[PDB]
């Protein structure tokens, strides 16, 4: 599945 899906934030 998806690589680098949440590198810009967690909120």
């Amino acid at each position, epitope marked *: 599945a*998806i*690589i*680098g*899906l*949440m*590198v*810009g*934030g*967690v*909120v």
Partner: antibody
Amino acid sequence: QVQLVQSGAEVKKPGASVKVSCKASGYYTEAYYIHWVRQAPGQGLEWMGRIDPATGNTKYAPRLQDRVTMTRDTSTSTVYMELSSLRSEDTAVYYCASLYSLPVYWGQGTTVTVSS
Amino acid sequence: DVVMTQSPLSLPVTLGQPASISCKSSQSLLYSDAKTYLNWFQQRPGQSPRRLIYQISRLDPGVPDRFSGSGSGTDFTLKISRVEAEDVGVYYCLQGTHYPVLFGQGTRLEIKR
């Protein structure tokens, strides 16, 4: 890889409501949180909120919480943003964007004009 | 609420000089992993905004080597080693660690003559 396509230019009157859509397409559109951001004339970028398409769960900028809603349609992988009680300082370019992903995938922008 | 303070607001730079932009948060942006969600965005006139950098120092694809990022916790800097005319625009930090997500107020970068 995802691609976001927004609804076109809108002209609305003060006090009214506007609804902007963002059609997602690609593999696993449900795994990307969609954000809305806006830029008024001269003004800085302002973050309006995100929706999780998986669950429909939303978070809003506090300055706007009372006035904006974010909704989803899973059959059509579309997300919607409704801004109520429009005043003229809401005239702006509104983008949807997967701000958390690498790279960020952007909509092309929708222009909203508040005026009689 | 976490508060983001970008500095300076307007940045006139002689062509070919280096430049830096400062972003300070009111609290740390270190999250429960060893990861720090500070991002840097650019908007040039007439264009859509783009992300330049994610996680303090990591370049997005398409971003030239001239842009670099640094800092930790509550204090961040965006460096441009050599300013060209294509760097004219507004630059924003964005904090992705604590609700609510929040852009800095923007730094306008222009060429000085």
